[PDB]
Amino acid sequence: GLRTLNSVWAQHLSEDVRRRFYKNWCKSKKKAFTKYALKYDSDAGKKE
Amino acid sequence: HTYHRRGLWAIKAKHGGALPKAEKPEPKFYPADDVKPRTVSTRKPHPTKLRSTITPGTVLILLAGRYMGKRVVFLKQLQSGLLLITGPFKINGVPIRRVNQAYVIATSTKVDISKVNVQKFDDKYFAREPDFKKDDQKVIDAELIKAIDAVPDLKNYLGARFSLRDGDKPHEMTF
């Protein structure tokens, strides 16, 4: 059957959608996609 | 299937056997039980038969022990029945040894050893009890290396170990 090949996310994700990745948003450091966003800054990251 | 005692002769052994009456031959302790005394046994156990494919100077593959697979030349069959073998010690590093008739395989390759003296080698020589042994080994190879050099490729053959490889059936191989 069908299989997920890969996924690419945008550089800016609102905190409304980033809350979906947490059971307790206000107790966390809110680190989701913080390092993924760094690919859009460098040049090797943009190559990926 | 010969009948040795086929005839009631018994006199071809003792022809002059008409002889006279036999003369029959403190304990310090009595064992309290009638134990029949143990005397030495007067039975001759008919020494072992050599395999008809093993003849002096034939080559043997060793099947077990620390020298398993060593291709070795056969010299003599000892009184106990163990075969006498040498490597020789120069080519494959196998010294003079006595091996059981089992644990060896007699190949069809032969070497002449007629002018080689193997007399002082016998069961007493191997009694569990070395410089002179190095001399005897040294003086028995140089009498045998040349005859090995006489046949082409026999030196590299004796210096290699036998092994079975993929698809090898020991019950079909000629050796």
């Binding site: - | 190949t107 069809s108 390759t109 490729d153 053959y157 036998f162 191989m173 000629t174 050796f175």
Partner: protein
Amino acid sequence: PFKRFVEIGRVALVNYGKDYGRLVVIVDVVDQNRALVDAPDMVRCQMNFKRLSLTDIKIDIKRIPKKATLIKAMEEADVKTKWENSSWGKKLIVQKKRAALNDFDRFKVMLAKIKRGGAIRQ
């Protein structure tokens, strides 16, 4: 267009038997499964086609040749070495030869094969 037929004069190889590897000539056909076969070294007998492999050789004879007539055709048609010089007949020959080799000859074949193999690579 088939290549090999059974008819009078076809030379066949006996497979699957005590007589395996021997050459026989089809001299008569009994029925759909059996044929009369005659050879230089055996008395004529019927054989199952299930135990016969037809070769590419075919000799000239009549239905029931005498033994002398059969020998002559097997010479006028040079069959023994035509079988042996073909690759098919050669394969049976060296299969016997390889099995017959003893330990010393097999060690020398190994020495030659290693020499031959290293030369191809070079």
